[PDB]
Amino acid sequence: TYDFTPLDSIISSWMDKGYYPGGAICVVKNDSVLFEKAYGSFTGDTKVYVASAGKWVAAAVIGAVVDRTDLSWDDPVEKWLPQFRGDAKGGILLRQLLSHTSGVRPYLPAPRVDNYNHLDSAVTEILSLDTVFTPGTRFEYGGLAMQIAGRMAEVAMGKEFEPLFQELIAAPLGMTHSHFAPVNTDGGHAPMLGGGLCTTLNDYIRFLKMIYHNGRSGNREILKPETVQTMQADQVRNAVVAPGEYVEKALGQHHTSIYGLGEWRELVDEATGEAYQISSPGWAGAYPWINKRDGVYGFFIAHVQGEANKKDGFSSFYGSPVLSETVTKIVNQ
């Protein structure tokens, strides 16, 4: 019998200040739902564009392809996409694309925006762009590199990325209201993999349950256990992490191993190098997480109105780990 008042108070205060028009949360501990509540206009089935919350899901689609084909985390781009031969980008590894360590430019040069609904067209435009640094040498967050990662999975399966998501992840989990494409163009819900995901509280909770159980759902192996472990491992490695990236800024943690495959390693045990809190926050307030020490997975879904970073110091991106912090307090007496 936990007391969830402190969490409810924080979320209600965001609604009372008009930061969001609505929202919903679900917190699960040791496979029991401890707290589930919708605010404002929302239900569990309200569809929301969740931006970077989809990076976690997109990495899982690619992991399901890696499980089924000769595609591997250490494959170079040019093995699969021969139009990249002759370009320094051809030697980028799949794991580097998904860990923000590729050196591919973060977003198209202004005023262009990658809103492509087909990755083959997206990747042709990305091919023309100079890199910003040598692969593996720096961490820099962005969206273009994951377009390339997605296209490599498309080629390995002979099938486009959105249909792959439905075949390999959404259908087997019973996610019925989710999609990466078509891409909404209102701003900040693009490119496809990095920011395109539209989902619901009920859909994304099914995804997190799967991840929490090391890729199993019931009697099905949705991802191999090793694939889930690799997604959660240090994929930044020796890349230089600049001061003030999300983990340092939002959580105060100073490890360099801040990212896996499409997911942040928010809290890490130094002695083992294992991450015990993992997340994929979006700029507009969506915050999914797992805390292995708590035995918790949860998801807050919402979309900020106005700017993400407001004059009272609230931030729908950098403020989000208050949710996992408050749950950690609650579930440990």
Q: How was this structure determined?
A: X-ray
CATH code, 1-333:
3.40.710.10
Beta-bridged to residue 23, according to DSSP, are 39
Provide the 10 A C-beta neighbour count for residue 256.
Answer: 17
Q: Are 105 and 132 in contact (CB under 8 A)?
A: yes
What is the token pair recorded at 286? 């969506």
> Using CA atoms, how far apart are residues 10 and 247, in angstroms rounded to an integer?
21
Amino acid at 50: V
What is the token pair recorded at 95? 């794991």
- Residue recorded with tokens 């190098």: 273
Element (H, E) at 40: strand 32-40
Q: Are 127 and 87 in contact (CB under 8 A)?
A: yes
| Region for 157 from its dihedrals, namely left if φ exceeds 0, alpha if ψ lies in -120 to 50, beta otherwise | alpha
Give one DSSP letter per residue of 71-89, joined into a string: --TT-BHHHH-GGGTTSGG
Q: Which of 290, 283, 227, 238 is nearest to 264 (CA)?
A: 290
Q: State the greatest distance between any 2 C-alpha atoms of the chain, in Å, as a whole number.
A: 62
> Using CA atoms, how far apart are residues 286 and 325, in angstroms rounded to an integer?
15
> Using CA atoms, how far apart are residues 133 and 136, in angstroms rounded to an integer?
9
Provide the 10 A C-beta neighbour count for residue 160.
Answer: 17
What is the token pair recorded at 13? 């205060």
What is the token pair recorded at 128? 């023309």
What is the token pair recorded at 197? 């995901």
CA atoms within 13 A on the CB side of 142: 25
Phi/psi for 249 (5° steps) reads -75, -40
Q: Which of 184, 165, 162, 163 is nearest to 175 (CA)?
A: 165
Q: What is the DSSP letter of 35?
A: E
Provide the 10 A C-beta neighbour count for residue 273.
Answer: 12
> Using CA atoms, how far apart are residues 309 and 320, in angstroms rounded to an integer?
12
Residue 71 in marked binding region? yes
What is the token pair recorded at 254? 């100073």
**Please, what's the b/e burial string for 290-313 (b: 16 or more CB within 10 A of its CB; e: otherwise)?**
bbbebebbbbbbbbbeeebeeeee
What is the token pair recorded at 324? 């996992």
Amino acid at 71: L
Give one DSSP letter per residue of 41-75, joined into a string: T--TT--EE-GGGHHHHHHHHHHHHHHHSS--TT-
- Residue recorded with tokens 């694939």: 227
> Using CA atoms, how far apart are residues 265 and 99, in angstroms rounded to an integer?
11
Give one DSSP letter per residue of 260-283, joined into a string: -SSSEEEEE-TTT--EEEEE---T
Q: Cα separations (Å) of 172 from 15, 167, 210, 224? A: 34, 7, 10, 14
Q: Cα separations (Å) of 256 from 55, 92, 135, 169, 270? A: 20, 21, 16, 30, 11
CA atoms within 13 A on the CB side of 209: 22
Give one DSSP letter per residue of 162-219, joined into a string: HHHHIIIIIHHHT--S-BS-SPP-SSSS-SHHHH--EE-HHHHHHHHHHHHTTTEETT
Provide the 10 A C-beta neighbour count for residue 152.
Answer: 24
Q: Are 139 and 58 in contact (CB under 8 A)?
A: no
Q: Which of 303, 27, 45, 41 is nearest to 199 (CA)?
A: 45
Q: Are 319 and 310 in contact (CB under 8 A)?
A: no
Order the strands of the 22-29 sheet from edge to edge: 32-40, 22-29, 296-301, 287-291, 275-279, 264-268
- Residue recorded with tokens 């912090």: 325
- Residue recorded with tokens 């430019």: 105
Residue 108 in marked binding region? no
Q: Are 291 and 275 in contact (CB under 8 A)?
A: no
Residue 185 in marked binding region? no
